[PDB]
Design an enzyme around this catalytic site. Structure first.
Site, short mmCIF file in Angstrom:
data_model
loop_
_atom_site.label_atom_id
_atom_site.label_comp_id
_atom_site.label_asym_id
_atom_site.label_seq_id
_atom_site.Cartn_x
_atom_site.Cartn_y
_atom_site.Cartn_z
N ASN A 115 0.84 -1.21 0.00
CA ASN A 115 0.00 0.00 0.00
C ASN A 115 0.86 1.24 0.00
O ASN A 115 1.97 1.27 0.59
CB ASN A 115 -0.93 -0.02 1.25
CG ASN A 115 -0.23 0.58 2.48
OD1 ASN A 115 -0.23 1.83 2.68
ND2 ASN A 115 0.42 -0.29 3.28
N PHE A 119 -1.23 8.30 4.29
CA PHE A 119 -1.86 9.00 5.44
C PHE A 119 -3.10 9.79 4.98
O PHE A 119 -3.25 10.97 5.27
CB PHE A 119 -0.88 10.00 6.11
CG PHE A 119 0.11 9.41 7.10
CD1 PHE A 119 -0.01 8.12 7.60
CD2 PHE A 119 1.15 10.25 7.60
CE1 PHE A 119 0.95 7.62 8.54
CE2 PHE A 119 2.10 9.79 8.56
CZ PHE A 119 1.98 8.44 9.01
N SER A 185 6.03 5.14 8.70
CA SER A 185 5.37 5.01 7.41
C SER A 185 6.35 5.14 6.26
O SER A 185 7.10 6.14 6.19
CB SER A 185 4.25 6.05 7.22
OG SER A 185 3.76 5.90 5.90
N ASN A 187 5.45 5.89 3.33
CA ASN A 187 4.69 6.60 2.30
C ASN A 187 4.58 8.10 2.53
O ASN A 187 3.81 8.77 1.83
CB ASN A 187 3.29 5.96 2.16
CG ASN A 187 3.41 4.48 1.82
OD1 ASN A 187 4.26 4.11 1.01
ND2 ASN A 187 2.67 3.63 2.52
N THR A 188 5.35 8.65 3.47
CA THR A 188 5.44 10.10 3.68
C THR A 188 6.92 10.48 3.65
O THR A 188 7.68 10.06 4.53
CB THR A 188 4.77 10.49 5.01
OG1 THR A 188 3.36 10.21 4.93
CG2 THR A 188 4.96 11.98 5.35
N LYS A 225 6.20 3.38 17.01
CA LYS A 225 6.09 2.32 16.02
C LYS A 225 7.23 2.44 15.03
O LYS A 225 7.44 3.50 14.43
CB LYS A 225 4.70 2.38 15.30
CG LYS A 225 4.47 1.22 14.31
CD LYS A 225 2.95 1.17 13.86
CE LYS A 225 2.79 -0.09 12.95
NZ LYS A 225 1.37 -0.02 12.52
N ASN A 254 6.07 -1.75 11.43
CA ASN A 254 5.32 -1.22 10.28
C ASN A 254 5.62 -2.10 9.04
O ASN A 254 6.30 -3.14 9.14
CB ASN A 254 5.71 0.25 10.06
CG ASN A 254 4.52 1.08 9.55
OD1 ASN A 254 3.83 0.65 8.60
ND2 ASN A 254 4.26 2.27 10.16
C1 FMN Z 1 -3.63 -0.95 3.77
C2 FMN Z 1 -2.73 -0.71 4.97
C3 FMN Z 1 -2.69 0.54 5.58
C4 FMN Z 1 -1.84 0.80 6.67
N1 FMN Z 1 -1.86 2.06 7.28
C5 FMN Z 1 -1.19 2.22 8.41
C6 FMN Z 1 -1.34 3.48 9.12
O1 FMN Z 1 -2.11 4.39 8.82
N2 FMN Z 1 -0.57 3.58 10.25
C7 FMN Z 1 0.31 2.60 10.74
O2 FMN Z 1 0.99 2.86 11.73
N3 FMN Z 1 0.42 1.39 10.10
C8 FMN Z 1 -0.31 1.22 8.99
N4 FMN Z 1 -0.24 0.00 8.32
C9 FMN Z 1 0.67 -1.03 8.85
C10 FMN Z 1 -0.02 -2.05 9.78
O3 FMN Z 1 -0.49 -1.37 10.96
C11 FMN Z 1 0.98 -3.15 10.15
O4 FMN Z 1 2.06 -2.50 10.86
C12 FMN Z 1 1.54 -3.91 8.94
O5 FMN Z 1 0.58 -3.96 7.87
C13 FMN Z 1 2.06 -5.30 9.28
O6 FMN Z 1 1.02 -6.12 9.83
P1 FMN Z 1 0.18 -7.21 8.86
O7 FMN Z 1 1.32 -8.00 8.13
O8 FMN Z 1 -0.55 -8.11 9.82
O9 FMN Z 1 -0.73 -6.41 7.88
C14 FMN Z 1 -1.04 -0.25 7.17
C15 FMN Z 1 -1.12 -1.52 6.59
C16 FMN Z 1 -1.93 -1.75 5.49
C17 FMN Z 1 -1.99 -3.14 4.90
O1 ORO Z 2 -1.00 5.64 5.00
C1 ORO Z 2 -0.12 4.89 4.59
O2 ORO Z 2 0.39 4.97 3.36
C2 ORO Z 2 0.59 3.99 5.54
C3 ORO Z 2 0.99 4.43 6.76
C4 ORO Z 2 1.80 3.58 7.59
O3 ORO Z 2 2.26 3.91 8.68
N1 ORO Z 2 2.11 2.32 7.06
C5 ORO Z 2 1.69 1.86 5.83
O4 ORO Z 2 2.04 0.78 5.38
N2 ORO Z 2 0.91 2.73 5.10
#
Ligand code: FMN
Ligand code: ORO
Ligand code: R4P
Ligand code: DET
Ligand code: DET
Ligand code: DDQ
Ligand code: DDQ
Ligand code: CL
Ligand code: NA
Ligand code: NA
Ligand code: NA
Length: 365
Positions: A115, A119, A185, A187-188, A225, A254
């Site tokens: 992804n 944000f 993140s 992505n920023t 994080k 993350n």
């Molecule tokens: C679509 C998507 C959006 C995410 N957005 C955020 C976010 O806004 N903030 C954050 O700290 N982590 C974000 N993450 C990361 C998850 O919180 C997690 O750290 C990461 O996906 C690993 O866990 P998983 O393998 O179980 O998905 C995002 C993950 C995905 C898949």
């Molecule tokens: O908003 C996102 O692009 C995002 C934020 C984050 O902390 N981690 C991630 O995978 N996506």
């Protein structure tokens, strides 16, 4: 295995994924969850799953990771799904749109997602009003062992990250059991360089000062994080600052900007953070290292590629007090929560642990 788990994993989720693009599926999921339209949460939490950490009781140690409920819309339906704690966010101070579409990609052969949302956030004011509207209900949930975390981000145009995070502390800190300073993140632009030692110490000093200025009853734990893509020097430095400042815990990890050898999905070269199974053991090793570097004294929430009880127990034994998942839900659907909890309980019993608490960090002993 229940009938729902197999039906969701083999029939319902593949059919939804064939009909809807990934972001539409995500939005539909948030909507159904927020309304409580969810399969029968057929698992009763054993006392073996209870964990006391971060100034709170957690009825079970399996949380929803940040990013699913970015704007605090589905909190109660996520408890109904069986999560022991919910994290919303990331939330930025002002509303902002995020990156252009397409910005989410499935890698089904890898059980992974990429992804680059960037944000996308309704902003602190909107989320503040949403949480205030259910604040007493959340007080009861927390008392009953179902705490709430808020993950804070920064706007893309922000000149100083520390003022963005401080504003999140002032506004949503009083509504959360714990806050997360998301400096990882992918992505920023420039965000992850907040993980270096000098910028991190100044940033987290400001965040802790703001948190300490909240009234005692409304004072959250603060966690940081981190990414899985850190050098050894970065990890050492983060552990040093966490201990010097009294940070309450870490979230590890993350998504990764790396692309491990062996990914098969056609979309593996898309820009963004990779999540799911290819992240799993990278995350677990980062937990193992951060636990040792903090002498087991700093609670860790372990996250990255958990889809089974074995995956959860490996992170706990590596040093996580709690685990989260997100990507597994996108492949298995809501039954995955009960699945992970039932398999974790069976494995705890099989390995001779009286409860989750006795297994935290057990590999290091
Ligand atoms: C679509 C998507 C959006 C995410 N957005 C955020 C976010 O806004 N903030 C954050 O700290 N982590 C974000 N993450 C990361 C998850 O919180 C997690 O750290 C990461 O996906 C690993 O866990 P998983 O393998 O179980 O998905 C995002 C993950 C995905 C898949
Ligand atoms: O908003 C996102 O692009 C995002 C934020 C984050 O902390 N981690 C991630 O995978 N996506
Ligand atoms: C089936 C169902 C019933 C009740 C409540 C929820 C569900 C459900 C349905 C879809 C999802 C889902 C799918 C995907 C995807 O890519 O296919 C996601 C997602 C969530 N978040 N990001 N992405 C990429 C999650 C949960
Ligand atoms: C200019 C700011 C406009 C409001 C912010 C945009 C909100 C993004 C909504 C996407 C929701 N979701 C994470 C479920 O895909
Ligand atoms: C398709 C589901 C597969 C689950 C296990 C996949 C192995 C993933 C390995 C991650 C890559 N690694 C970083 C360890 O080199
Ligand atoms: C997000 C799309 C979901 C489509 C299928 C959802 C089934 C709903 C669960 C059944 N029920 C309403 C009784 O909980
Ligand atoms: C004090 C007991 C700590 C762990 C005991 C149970 C572990 C079972 C598996 C051990 N193993 C063979 C994987 O090394
Ligand atoms: Cl308040
Ligand atoms: Na969206
Ligand atoms: Na080191
Ligand atoms: Na230091």
């Amino acid at each position: 295995a229940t009938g729902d788990e197999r039906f969701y994993a083999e029939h319902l989720m593949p059919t939804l994924q064939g009909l809807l693009d990934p972001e539409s599926a995500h939005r539909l999921a948030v909507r159904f969850t927020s309304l409580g339209l969810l399969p029968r949460a057929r698992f009763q939490d054993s006392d073996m799953l209870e964990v006391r950490v971060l100034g709170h009781k957690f009825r079970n140690p399996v949380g929803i990771a940040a990013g699913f409920d970015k704007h605090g819309e589905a909190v109660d339906g996520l408890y109904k799904m069986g999560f022991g704690f919910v994290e919303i966010g990331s939330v930025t101070p002002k509303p902002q749109e995020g990156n252009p579409r397409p910005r989410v990609f499935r890698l089904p052969e890898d059980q992974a997602v990429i992804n680059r949302y960037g944000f996308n956030s309704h902003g602190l004011s909107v989320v503040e009003h949403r949480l205030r509207a259910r604040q007493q209900k959340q007080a009861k949930l927390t008392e009953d062992g179902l705490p709430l975390g808020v993950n804070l981000g920064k706007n893309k145009t922000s000149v100083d990250a520390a003022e963005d995070y401080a504003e999140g502390v002032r506004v949503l800190g009083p509504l959360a059991d714990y806050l997360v300073v998301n400096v990882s993140s992918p992505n920023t632009a420039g965000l992850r360089s907040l993980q270096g030692k000098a910028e991190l110490r100044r940033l987290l000093t400001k965040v802790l000062q703001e948190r300490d200025g909240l009234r005692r009853v409304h004072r959250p734990a603060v966690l940081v994080k981190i990414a899985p893509d850190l050098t050894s020097q970065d990890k050492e430095d983060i552990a040093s600052v966490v201990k010097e400042l009294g940070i309450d815990g870490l979230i590890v990890t993350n998504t990764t900007v790396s692309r491990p050898a062996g990914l098969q999905g056609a979309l593996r070269s898309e820009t963004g953070g990779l999540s799911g199974k290819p992240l799993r053991d990278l995350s677990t090793q980062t937990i193992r290292e951060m636990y040792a570097l903090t002498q087991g004294r700093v609670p860790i929430i372990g996250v990255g590629g958990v889809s089974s009880g074995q995956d959860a127990l490996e992170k706990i034994r590596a040093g996580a007090s709690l685990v989260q998942l997100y990507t597994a839900l996108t492949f298995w659907g809501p039954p995955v929560v009960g699945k992970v909890k039932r398999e974790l309980e069976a494995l705890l019993k099989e390995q001779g642990f009286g409860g989750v608490t006795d297994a935290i960090g057990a590999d290091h002993r």
